[PDB]
Amino acid sequence: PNDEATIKALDNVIKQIEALSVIVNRSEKADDAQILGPNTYKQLLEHLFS
């Protein structure tokens, strides 16, 4: 056996495992709530007589 291929294979598999073990899962999504604004009731036309 060529002892220099085993070392390279071990290094490669160790690098793969180390790379796979650093990935993090973090999400910073917003919320579905809607910001509300001010409003004023409007007046419908009316007629007054006595």
């Binding site: 056996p1 060529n2 291929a5 085993t6 294979a9 071990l10």
Partner: protein, 50 residues
């Protein structure tokens, strides 16, 4: 697989295989094949044997 005409032409002329290489080159090639198999087996035994 060989066709009939080729075999007949080979047998009519009394052909025989011929070579210009020595014995040691062939055994070196066979040793190389065995070394490759041993390298792969050693890598599998030291990494993948579970």
């Amino acid at each position: 697989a060989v066709e009939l005409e080729q075999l007949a032409a080979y047998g009519l002329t009394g052909a025989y295989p011929r070579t210009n290489h020595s014995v040691d080159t062939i055994v070196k090639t066979v040793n190389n094949i065995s070394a490759t198999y041993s390298t792969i087996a050693q890598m599998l035994s030291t990494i993948d044997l579970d």
